[PDB]
Amino acid sequence: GNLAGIMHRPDSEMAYVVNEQTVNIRLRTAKDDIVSVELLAGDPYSLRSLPTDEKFYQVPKQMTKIMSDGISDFWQVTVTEPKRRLAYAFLVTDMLGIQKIYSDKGFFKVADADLMDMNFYFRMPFFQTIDQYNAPEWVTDTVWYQIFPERFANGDVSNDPVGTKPWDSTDHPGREDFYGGDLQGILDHLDHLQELGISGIYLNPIFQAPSNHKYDTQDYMTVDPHFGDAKLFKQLVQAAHERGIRVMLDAVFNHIGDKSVQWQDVLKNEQASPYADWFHIHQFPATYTPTDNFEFAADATYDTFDYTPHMPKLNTSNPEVVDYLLNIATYWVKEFDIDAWRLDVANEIDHHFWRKFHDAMMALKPDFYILGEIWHTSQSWLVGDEFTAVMNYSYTGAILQYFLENESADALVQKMSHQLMLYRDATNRMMFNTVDSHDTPRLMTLAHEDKQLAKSILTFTFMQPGVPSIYYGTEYGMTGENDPDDRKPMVWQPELQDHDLYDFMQKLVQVRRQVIAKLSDDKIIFDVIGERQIRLTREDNQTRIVGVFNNGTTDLTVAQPTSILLKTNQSETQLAPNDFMIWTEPVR
Amino acid sequence: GNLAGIMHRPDSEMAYVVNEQTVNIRLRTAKDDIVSVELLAGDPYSLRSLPTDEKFYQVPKQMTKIMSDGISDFWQVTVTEPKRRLAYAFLVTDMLGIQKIYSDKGFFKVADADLMDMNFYFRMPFFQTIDQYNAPEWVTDTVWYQIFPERFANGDVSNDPVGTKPWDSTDHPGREDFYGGDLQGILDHLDHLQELGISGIYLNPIFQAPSNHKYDTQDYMTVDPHFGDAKLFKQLVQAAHERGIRVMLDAVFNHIGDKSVQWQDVLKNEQASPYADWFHIHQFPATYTPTDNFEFAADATYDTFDYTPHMPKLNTSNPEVVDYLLNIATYWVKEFDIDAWRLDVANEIDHHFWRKFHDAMMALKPDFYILGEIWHTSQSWLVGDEFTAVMNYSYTGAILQYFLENESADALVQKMSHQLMLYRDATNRMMFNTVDSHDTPRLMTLAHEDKQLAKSILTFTFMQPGVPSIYYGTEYGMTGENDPDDRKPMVWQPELQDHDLYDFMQKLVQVRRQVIAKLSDDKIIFDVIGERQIRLTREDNQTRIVGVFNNGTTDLTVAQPTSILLKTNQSETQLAPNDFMIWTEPVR
Ligand SMILES: [Ca+2]
Ligand SMILES: [Ca+2]
């Protein structure tokens, strides 16, 4: 067999605690190289301490091949052990029938393995629930809706910025435009969110800042006055909660804006500023050479987000900065009862800080949801001690690549399988899936205004393990290239709304919340059934949901389902190119 | 090539911060499958934000194959980046000349890789020294000596336990015997430790407890009165420090003894005890059925170390237990200035506790040494936020297996290489190498009283990256089977001491402290030069230390070295079976 392709990393996503007496264990092997895997496992001390002749290694446990990413196969098994201590090793057999034991000490013929020595084995030394990953149950039933507040609704002209433009959803907004959207406008349209069926709002930043996006924070402790005030924000959160809608705010903790009190003090006082060590200043005075692009300088003497001199990086290792940020994080939760924090550029802040942040948030609300913005592999933030999940851009990006280009279905399934096997099973359910956002081109533009294709992408994404989010306006087919063009004023004029797409998104949200979210500990299966034809199955012990997606250039015939939930062709058996059909069937 | 054998895990021992601007990156490949690896790396934001035509991926960095474990090859490179943000990917070429790029997104032909997208790459998002692993420099120059205090020297008969036996190093001690060793006896023989050349003492537990080993703690805040008192312990630490000898105590935090106040309160008050939740009690009253072995019960209604009813497991998730243990840990450091804690059964206590323990100790002493007792892979405790090192029993165990049995030299080198590549380079230097201890048979007994073999094992171990420790009496050739027979009274009678071995150990300690410890950032090379013949090389930029070990059954001829440091044959060119020769040569 392919020994170099076999790996088990103890105390990781391959060996983790699910509850006080139960663990999940995974093994990686080379794809289709290993025919079977059994786990030998039990209490390490039992081997030599118990007087019985029975030994734990005499009764193997079968592992199941759960996924493949085209390179490796991934095997898993759940183990219960009342003594809450586990030693384990793997019996692996290849295609030619060659069997070896694989353990912490390496590979062995069975006859050569020192199975009576607890130290031969990999170890889960004591099952520690304090160290485990916990998924908040409420997220399961959530469909999110993301609001960029400057652009959702102007509920109050009296707080509008100077130079506010007329509300026109057909505009191509510039980087520094204002349209007057505010918190009163969100409050005014909660009925729309409830009618669409969403149950969580993700707001882009709302704290005082000079820009239309407010990632260049001036004051984290104040609602931007062009958006509202503390009383209005409290009213909004209470009104959302009364409708069953939770609220997630955007925490911009990697960097602060250059008009903050703290940075302005650095500019006045140089190294004598009480805030000098709140930043990463290489040379005083803190300077840069302006360029024709306000968001770029080549030579700032301080670290910044990207290369913008207006977003000096915060030194989150400084205890005073830690205290400042934790007090902000605590304030909005304690005083306004928000349900979650989305963490902007979360990967560029240290793990030490995020552990303290986690502990502080869980002390306030044990079911708090902590969502990191990270666009690459995020294993080290998703162990159970830092974030709940990340914005799952690598996953939705693979989906977009499949539907919009000509990849094989095999390639998509391989990428999604790779992603799922990076993380604990419960973590995968908490991932935040949005096909587009304020940082991407709009779905309907990527789809070249092919509504059927847009519906296929949305439906496929809504069937995935992660929780889905709808970027404002998706439900009416809003167009836009990347930022700033993805931030058009929300389309409230019915003549400009795609009503068929809105009806469809209502139905899709209902399939997600009433069917997909109510399966019990389901298994997901990706089957490639033909060229660019995928059958997605989610199933529990009584009910199976199946989605067939035909994204080739030919028609596809399927058996007539008894219980169709959602489809795009008028036929109950025929799928034309880019059609899909979702149905439900009992498990037999 | 063997794609399933290639792996890079970001934010791990394969990608870690060395200093503010410098990182080490590793890649695993299948053994001898990949001919070369180049790293493509630079600031993620530079690709699209800088106006230059130059891109970081245009100038690859060569990686070096540093080790192989017989299954995989391990490649490494050091990267400096002033912007302190790194995106990277690997250019891998196999034996047939097939080249691909390997990144966070998978494997690609170069022409198909989206090299302008920062999210294509693996990421070190910002170099965080607060998250990095730090090795305390003083450990580099240390040779440790481990004292089991009941058995090292009786410096005071007046504190002896009832039934203390005459001091006789030829006895075979029973599990419950006492010989009267105490802290005054250690103080009395500091001259012996200084003459041997050791610079650190590791003490087995010294706090109040009823047994001869004192792992069944009664009171962590009191020196056991048969050993001494607080004034005497302070005198000992100051006398050790005056000689340049640091002091490491044994922290027994997984479990407490059943004669502790806390457990006795549980026995009196059942669940109404204020200490009920300091333990893991499944059923009250806390009970067990005694057996003929005092260290075993089959049915204790509470979790224990192993199956002994006398060592109830502590619930270290309980904040009151956390506070109690941290106050103990702090007390001995603050009040007595000890230099290190050795953590008994450290793997069975949760990571959350060990992070708090780490933070508390480093706040007292930034160069504190935290040594975990773990007999299996220990990656998750050695990231930089918990322990400094572990007792390196898997490494010394592989060495013993080679010298005492008939393994190939290839097998030993593979095992040591596997071990080193589990951990960060600096971590490997901090590992605590002891060939025997109070929990193993004695070296001289494992070697069947073959002194030459014992010398070979010690010398080979002392050339390894980790810091070595001498279990008391090794220097005089003490014998013993496993516990309790490995705890004989120290041999102070010259007629019973191996003086030739003592002289040799003095010389070996000097080679370690004066030569091996004074190389500058050396590279270690394991060469198998013949059947059971190994050439071990450690070298920096000016000086190379070479050890040749002949453990076959034939003679071995080597070139006459100019500068022999240590050897066992009278010849300067001939090594008989089990001879070795260490020499030094300039690097050219
Ligand atoms: Ca307004
Ligand atoms: Ca005594």
mmCIF file of C-alpha atoms in Angstrom, chain A residues 256-482:
data_model
loop_
_atom_site.group_PDB
_atom_site.id
_atom_site.type_symbol
_atom_site.label_atom_id
_atom_site.label_comp_id
_atom_site.label_asym_id
_atom_site.label_seq_id
_atom_site.Cartn_x
_atom_site.Cartn_y
_atom_site.Cartn_z
ATOM 1 C CA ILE A 256 -8.547 51.390 13.473
ATOM 2 C CA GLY A 257 -9.275 54.389 11.275
ATOM 3 C CA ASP A 258 -6.823 57.259 11.116
ATOM 4 C CA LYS A 259 -9.414 59.760 12.386
ATOM 5 C CA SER A 260 -9.745 57.889 15.692
ATOM 6 C CA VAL A 261 -8.761 59.762 18.848
ATOM 7 C CA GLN A 262 -5.948 57.243 19.366
ATOM 8 C CA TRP A 263 -4.295 57.668 15.968
ATOM 9 C CA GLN A 264 -4.740 61.437 16.009
ATOM 10 C CA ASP A 265 -2.956 61.449 19.374
ATOM 11 C CA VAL A 266 -0.077 59.544 17.769
ATOM 12 C CA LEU A 267 0.088 62.150 15.030
ATOM 13 C CA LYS A 268 0.193 64.944 17.608
ATOM 14 C CA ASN A 269 2.519 63.453 20.209
ATOM 15 C CA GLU A 270 4.661 60.883 18.291
ATOM 16 C CA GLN A 271 6.214 58.302 20.597
ATOM 17 C CA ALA A 272 5.152 60.267 23.672
ATOM 18 C CA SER A 273 1.539 59.496 22.825
ATOM 19 C CA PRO A 274 -0.156 57.225 25.406
ATOM 20 C CA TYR A 275 -1.286 55.276 22.326
ATOM 21 C CA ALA A 276 2.094 54.831 20.606
ATOM 22 C CA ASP A 277 2.325 51.161 21.561
ATOM 23 C CA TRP A 278 -1.298 50.519 20.536
ATOM 24 C CA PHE A 279 0.074 50.440 16.978
ATOM 25 C CA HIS A 280 2.975 48.996 14.947
ATOM 26 C CA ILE A 281 5.048 52.128 14.293
ATOM 27 C CA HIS A 282 8.473 51.531 12.768
ATOM 28 C CA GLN A 283 9.601 55.141 12.578
ATOM 29 C CA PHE A 284 8.311 58.343 14.155
ATOM 30 C CA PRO A 285 6.740 60.627 13.147
ATOM 31 C CA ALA A 286 4.157 58.256 11.685
ATOM 32 C CA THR A 287 4.155 59.330 8.031
ATOM 33 C CA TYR A 288 3.405 58.225 4.487
ATOM 34 C CA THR A 289 3.656 59.678 1.001
ATOM 35 C CA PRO A 290 0.178 60.175 -0.504
ATOM 36 C CA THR A 291 -0.605 58.758 -3.930
ATOM 37 C CA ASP A 292 -3.411 59.345 -6.424
ATOM 38 C CA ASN A 293 -5.225 56.382 -4.823
ATOM 39 C CA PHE A 294 -6.393 57.370 -1.353
ATOM 40 C CA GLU A 295 -6.347 53.704 -0.333
ATOM 41 C CA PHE A 296 -2.658 53.174 -1.180
ATOM 42 C CA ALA A 297 0.689 54.361 0.132
ATOM 43 C CA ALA A 298 4.003 52.676 -0.631
ATOM 44 C CA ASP A 299 6.008 53.818 2.377
ATOM 45 C CA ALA A 300 3.872 54.248 5.504
ATOM 46 C CA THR A 301 6.126 54.024 8.553
ATOM 47 C CA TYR A 302 3.561 51.866 10.367
ATOM 48 C CA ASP A 303 1.859 48.570 9.608
ATOM 49 C CA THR A 304 -1.558 48.911 8.018
ATOM 50 C CA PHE A 305 -4.365 46.858 6.659
ATOM 51 C CA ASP A 306 -3.193 46.074 3.102
ATOM 52 C CA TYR A 307 -1.252 49.232 2.079
ATOM 53 C CA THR A 308 -3.825 51.838 3.110
ATOM 54 C CA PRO A 309 -2.361 54.556 5.342
ATOM 55 C CA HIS A 310 -5.837 55.259 6.737
ATOM 56 C CA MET A 311 -6.106 51.902 8.569
ATOM 57 C CA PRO A 312 -3.191 51.606 10.997
ATOM 58 C CA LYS A 313 -2.917 48.074 12.412
ATOM 59 C CA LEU A 314 -3.734 47.654 16.106
ATOM 60 C CA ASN A 315 -1.215 45.971 18.382
ATOM 61 C CA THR A 316 -3.533 43.404 19.936
ATOM 62 C CA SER A 317 -0.654 41.940 22.024
ATOM 63 C CA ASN A 318 -0.664 45.126 24.125
ATOM 64 C CA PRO A 319 -2.745 44.477 27.287
ATOM 65 C CA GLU A 320 -4.276 47.972 27.027
ATOM 66 C CA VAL A 321 -5.522 47.170 23.514
ATOM 67 C CA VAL A 322 -6.758 43.762 24.671
ATOM 68 C CA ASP A 323 -8.724 45.467 27.450
ATOM 69 C CA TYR A 324 -10.099 48.143 25.107
ATOM 70 C CA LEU A 325 -11.310 45.625 22.510
ATOM 71 C CA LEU A 326 -12.763 43.219 25.054
ATOM 72 C CA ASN A 327 -14.658 46.096 26.665
ATOM 73 C CA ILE A 328 -16.114 47.019 23.233
ATOM 74 C CA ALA A 329 -17.000 43.378 22.528
ATOM 75 C CA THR A 330 -18.663 43.055 25.946
ATOM 76 C CA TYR A 331 -20.509 46.366 25.719
ATOM 77 C CA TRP A 332 -22.535 45.664 22.625
ATOM 78 C CA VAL A 333 -23.496 42.186 23.870
ATOM 79 C CA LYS A 334 -24.347 43.179 27.437
ATOM 80 C CA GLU A 335 -26.100 46.454 26.701
ATOM 81 C CA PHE A 336 -27.852 45.579 23.432
ATOM 82 C CA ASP A 337 -28.163 41.774 23.558
ATOM 83 C CA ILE A 338 -26.668 41.108 20.120
ATOM 84 C CA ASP A 339 -26.308 37.416 19.269
ATOM 85 C CA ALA A 340 -23.042 37.178 17.351
ATOM 86 C CA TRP A 341 -19.887 38.964 16.221
ATOM 87 C CA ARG A 342 -18.487 38.736 12.696
ATOM 88 C CA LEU A 343 -14.697 39.327 12.902
ATOM 89 C CA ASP A 344 -13.250 41.425 10.084
ATOM 90 C CA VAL A 345 -9.795 40.280 8.809
ATOM 91 C CA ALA A 346 -9.816 37.909 11.775
ATOM 92 C CA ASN A 347 -6.792 35.890 10.671
ATOM 93 C CA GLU A 348 -4.407 38.854 11.125
ATOM 94 C CA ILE A 349 -5.086 39.066 14.916
ATOM 95 C CA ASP A 350 -3.277 36.700 17.269
ATOM 96 C CA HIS A 351 -4.717 33.502 18.756
ATOM 97 C CA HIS A 352 -4.000 34.698 22.294
ATOM 98 C CA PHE A 353 -6.430 37.561 21.815
ATOM 99 C CA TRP A 354 -9.082 35.385 20.206
ATOM 100 C CA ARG A 355 -8.985 32.946 23.129
ATOM 101 C CA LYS A 356 -9.583 35.801 25.546
ATOM 102 C CA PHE A 357 -12.352 37.111 23.273
ATOM 103 C CA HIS A 358 -13.943 33.658 23.132
ATOM 104 C CA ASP A 359 -13.831 33.225 26.896
ATOM 105 C CA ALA A 360 -15.346 36.675 27.472
ATOM 106 C CA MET A 361 -18.179 36.107 25.002
ATOM 107 C CA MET A 362 -19.056 32.616 26.277
ATOM 108 C CA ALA A 363 -19.118 33.954 29.833
ATOM 109 C CA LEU A 364 -21.793 36.397 28.744
ATOM 110 C CA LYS A 365 -23.737 34.008 26.463
ATOM 111 C CA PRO A 366 -22.805 30.311 26.327
ATOM 112 C CA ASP A 367 -24.534 30.016 22.913
ATOM 113 C CA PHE A 368 -22.750 33.029 21.392
ATOM 114 C CA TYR A 369 -21.805 32.776 17.716
ATOM 115 C CA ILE A 370 -18.295 33.941 16.730
ATOM 116 C CA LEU A 371 -17.783 34.185 12.967
ATOM 117 C CA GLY A 372 -14.284 34.879 11.578
ATOM 118 C CA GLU A 373 -13.734 36.502 8.167
ATOM 119 C CA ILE A 374 -10.976 34.262 6.687
ATOM 120 C CA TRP A 375 -10.674 33.350 2.985
ATOM 121 C CA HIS A 376 -8.160 30.493 3.374
ATOM 122 C CA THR A 377 -7.956 27.307 5.480
ATOM 123 C CA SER A 378 -9.036 28.140 9.012
ATOM 124 C CA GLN A 379 -8.325 24.998 11.087
ATOM 125 C CA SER A 380 -6.349 26.741 13.811
ATOM 126 C CA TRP A 381 -9.245 29.102 14.658
ATOM 127 C CA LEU A 382 -11.910 26.367 14.710
ATOM 128 C CA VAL A 383 -10.666 24.001 17.436
ATOM 129 C CA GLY A 384 -13.321 25.072 19.960
ATOM 130 C CA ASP A 385 -11.481 27.834 21.896
ATOM 131 C CA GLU A 386 -11.631 30.734 19.423
ATOM 132 C CA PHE A 387 -14.267 31.030 16.667
ATOM 133 C CA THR A 388 -17.445 29.061 15.995
ATOM 134 C CA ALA A 389 -17.025 29.258 12.240
ATOM 135 C CA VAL A 390 -15.673 31.321 9.369
ATOM 136 C CA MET A 391 -17.213 32.955 6.345
ATOM 137 C CA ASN A 392 -16.916 29.959 4.092
ATOM 138 C CA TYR A 393 -15.593 31.652 0.963
ATOM 139 C CA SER A 394 -13.370 28.732 -0.113
ATOM 140 C CA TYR A 395 -16.444 26.459 -0.170
ATOM 141 C CA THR A 396 -18.858 28.805 -1.957
ATOM 142 C CA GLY A 397 -16.026 29.844 -4.250
ATOM 143 C CA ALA A 398 -15.619 26.242 -5.385
ATOM 144 C CA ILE A 399 -19.367 26.034 -5.991
ATOM 145 C CA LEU A 400 -19.307 29.212 -8.084
ATOM 146 C CA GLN A 401 -16.344 27.910 -10.098
ATOM 147 C CA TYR A 402 -18.265 24.749 -10.953
ATOM 148 C CA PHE A 403 -21.508 26.379 -11.983
ATOM 149 C CA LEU A 404 -19.956 29.291 -13.879
ATOM 150 C CA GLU A 405 -17.182 27.473 -15.699
ATOM 151 C CA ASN A 406 -16.795 24.018 -17.179
ATOM 152 C CA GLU A 407 -15.170 22.018 -14.394
ATOM 153 C CA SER A 408 -16.031 18.399 -13.967
ATOM 154 C CA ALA A 409 -18.500 17.494 -11.265
ATOM 155 C CA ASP A 410 -15.712 15.288 -9.915
ATOM 156 C CA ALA A 411 -13.531 18.362 -9.324
ATOM 157 C CA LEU A 412 -16.257 20.177 -7.369
ATOM 158 C CA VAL A 413 -17.029 17.152 -5.219
ATOM 159 C CA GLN A 414 -13.329 16.696 -4.508
ATOM 160 C CA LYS A 415 -12.969 20.305 -3.379
ATOM 161 C CA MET A 416 -16.029 20.219 -1.128
ATOM 162 C CA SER A 417 -14.898 16.921 0.369
ATOM 163 C CA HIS A 418 -11.447 18.331 1.058
ATOM 164 C CA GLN A 419 -13.059 21.300 2.835
ATOM 165 C CA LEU A 420 -15.330 19.199 5.003
ATOM 166 C CA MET A 421 -12.484 16.953 6.069
ATOM 167 C CA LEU A 422 -10.420 19.918 7.287
ATOM 168 C CA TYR A 423 -12.812 20.459 10.211
ATOM 169 C CA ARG A 424 -14.810 18.760 12.920
ATOM 170 C CA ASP A 425 -18.266 17.635 11.791
ATOM 171 C CA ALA A 426 -20.100 20.134 14.001
ATOM 172 C CA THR A 427 -17.858 22.973 12.774
ATOM 173 C CA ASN A 428 -18.895 22.242 9.188
ATOM 174 C CA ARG A 429 -22.526 22.796 10.197
ATOM 175 C CA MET A 430 -21.649 26.238 11.642
ATOM 176 C CA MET A 431 -19.810 27.572 8.568
ATOM 177 C CA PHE A 432 -21.378 30.690 7.044
ATOM 178 C CA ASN A 433 -22.110 30.149 3.327
ATOM 179 C CA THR A 434 -22.706 33.276 1.248
ATOM 180 C CA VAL A 435 -22.314 33.141 -2.494
ATOM 181 C CA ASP A 436 -21.628 36.889 -2.681
ATOM 182 C CA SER A 437 -21.047 39.751 -0.266
ATOM 183 C CA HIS A 438 -19.965 43.385 -0.031
ATOM 184 C CA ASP A 439 -16.477 42.141 -1.037
ATOM 185 C CA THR A 440 -17.416 40.195 -4.216
ATOM 186 C CA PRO A 441 -19.242 40.687 -7.530
ATOM 187 C CA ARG A 442 -22.963 39.959 -7.249
ATOM 188 C CA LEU A 443 -24.282 36.463 -8.042
ATOM 189 C CA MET A 444 -26.611 37.716 -10.766
ATOM 190 C CA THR A 445 -23.707 39.486 -12.489
ATOM 191 C CA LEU A 446 -21.418 36.473 -12.198
ATOM 192 C CA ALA A 447 -24.240 34.419 -13.748
ATOM 193 C CA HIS A 448 -24.551 36.889 -16.676
ATOM 194 C CA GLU A 449 -28.156 37.510 -15.643
ATOM 195 C CA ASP A 450 -29.038 33.843 -16.258
ATOM 196 C CA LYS A 451 -31.711 33.483 -13.582
ATOM 197 C CA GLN A 452 -31.886 29.705 -13.926
ATOM 198 C CA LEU A 453 -28.177 29.449 -13.263
ATOM 199 C CA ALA A 454 -28.473 31.796 -10.276
ATOM 200 C CA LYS A 455 -31.275 29.620 -8.853
ATOM 201 C CA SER A 456 -29.137 26.482 -9.310
ATOM 202 C CA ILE A 457 -26.183 28.049 -7.467
ATOM 203 C CA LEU A 458 -28.366 29.252 -4.597
ATOM 204 C CA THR A 459 -30.173 25.908 -4.255
ATOM 205 C CA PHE A 460 -26.968 23.888 -4.352
ATOM 206 C CA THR A 461 -25.454 26.148 -1.697
ATOM 207 C CA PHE A 462 -28.553 25.987 0.500
ATOM 208 C CA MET A 463 -28.307 22.156 0.540
ATOM 209 C CA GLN A 464 -24.770 22.244 2.040
ATOM 210 C CA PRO A 465 -23.959 21.605 5.722
ATOM 211 C CA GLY A 466 -23.121 25.214 6.509
ATOM 212 C CA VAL A 467 -25.715 27.847 7.333
ATOM 213 C CA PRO A 468 -26.660 30.045 4.341
ATOM 214 C CA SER A 469 -26.742 33.829 4.074
ATOM 215 C CA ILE A 470 -28.477 36.058 1.513
ATOM 216 C CA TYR A 471 -26.681 39.298 0.642
ATOM 217 C CA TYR A 472 -29.291 42.105 0.534
ATOM 218 C CA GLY A 473 -30.998 42.319 -2.851
ATOM 219 C CA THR A 474 -30.113 38.800 -4.020
ATOM 220 C CA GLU A 475 -33.797 37.928 -3.638
ATOM 221 C CA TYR A 476 -34.724 40.497 -6.319
ATOM 222 C CA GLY A 477 -31.841 39.746 -8.696
ATOM 223 C CA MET A 478 -29.655 42.790 -8.025
ATOM 224 C CA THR A 479 -26.652 43.175 -10.278
ATOM 225 C CA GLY A 480 -23.205 44.526 -9.584
ATOM 226 C CA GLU A 481 -19.520 44.083 -10.296
ATOM 227 C CA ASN A 482 -17.081 44.044 -7.380
#
